[PDB]
Structures are given as structure tokens and as C-alpha cells.
Design a protein around this ligand. Sequence first.
Ligand SMILES: NS(=O)(=O)c1cccs1
Ligand SMILES: [Zn+2]
Length: 258
Amino acid sequence: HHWGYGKHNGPEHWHKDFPIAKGERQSPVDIDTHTAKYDPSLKPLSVSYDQATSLRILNNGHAFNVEFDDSQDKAVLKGGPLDGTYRLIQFHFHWGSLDGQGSEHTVDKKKYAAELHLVHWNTKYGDFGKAVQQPDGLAVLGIFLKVGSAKPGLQKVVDVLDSIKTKGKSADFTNFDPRGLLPESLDYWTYPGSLTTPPLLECVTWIVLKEPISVSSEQVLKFRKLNFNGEGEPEELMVDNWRPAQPLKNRQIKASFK
Ligand SMILES: NS(=O)(=O)c1cccs1
Ligand SMILES: [Zn+2]
């Protein structure tokens, strides 16, 4: 009996426990590509993932997270609109019950089948828990997934899902290279926003890549076999774990490309 994505506890209800849900810098948003402002002052992204150390994969009851060792500068994101160095701590996905929905951000109202979030925190704040309390604390790289050809670099994640089917299950997940999840181009949009699940803190610089990656129908089908529930509880399939677009309010979306 807490927040989730059901009819009785889903995104429309969250504001009752987390009033920041109606705040001024909430995410996700629709990216209107014609009113995004090209900003020549924006730098290319620098993704340095060569020394990434993955540790574990966890079903936390609303998604599955692949967690990384963030006790040193092993996998970091720099450049773009960021000042300073952000360390990778985990990635996860949001996805739908059908191929025509699943992403959190939309592009000219278009929904993708899923959205990948690579979550990084600003090393100047020392730990992730301190970082989420700051307006420049996190940087999340958002990558859209469309259904088409399979993504070979995603298959190791798909094959382990049977082992973490229910809430609270975890499995060792070492030597996974997140470089296999990136598109060819690193062109992006960026805007200031928030976590898209409770506690909905307004601490995120969003960097959303223009180029989607393709995954196969069989790959995304396997995401839809996970459960929101714990073992021994009534089965509820983990699907549609996305928050709908929020008002842009007083914000400008910037593009790194024209
Ligand atoms: N979905 S997200 O990337 O904004 C997020 C929620 C909690 C930690 S990171
Ligand atoms: Zn997310």
C-alpha cells in the first residue's frame, strides 16, 4: 500500500504523498522539436565508460536496476551542459504493455516502446544521497528504444531477467559493458527537471539523445514478464511503469544540434 503505477496508486495520486509532484521543474516532458533552441555554446558529451564495473541487477518493485561500483571515477559523464564530473551509479528502463507506449519523454508527442535511463551523480556532493538534495546533483542520460532489429549488447540483461522476476530479488551481474547500449550519435536535447518516480526531487539535468536504439520484439517481450509483486504474492505484470508528460512551465529545452 504505497505508490506505484496502478489505478489506485499511480502517477495521478502521487501528489498526495509527494506534493513536489506539482512543482515547477517536473519530468518527463514532451520535447517539441520546433521550439527547442539550438545552443552553440553546448559542448559534446564525454562518456567515459571503459572502466565501468557492474555489480548486481535488482528488481526493486517498479523497475530493474543494474548497479555499478561508484566508489571511484570509473564510469563518468562530463561535458555537454554539465560542470564537473558525474559518476554512473545505475541504469534502468521504463516500458509499456504494447509497443506504442512505454517511454517517459515524448518527441513531438511520439511515444517510444521504452526508455533507458543512465543515472549519474555529481561527485562534488560526495554521495548519491547528498546529490539528490541539490539542483545540479544528478545527470540522467535518456535513450529511446524502438522495436525493430535486436540489440546484441542488451541480450545479457534480457537473459538474466528470469532470475529476478519478483520484487526484492537480486543477482550478481558483473562485467557488463554499458557502451553496448549507446546509439551511434550523441546529439541531444537538455533541460532541467526531476526524478520521474517518488520522491520526485528536482535535482536532475536531463540529457535526452536524439537517436533511438533498436531492440527486437522478443527482447522487449521479456521485460513484460517481470512482476511488480514479491514472491508468493498475487501476480501483477511489470508493464507501463512510466509517468506521463508534465507541464514545461518556465523552462526552455536546448538542442546540441540544428
Ligand atoms: N527515472 S529517473 O531516472 O528519473 C530516477 C528515479 C529514481 C532514481 S533515478
Ligand atoms: Zn527512470
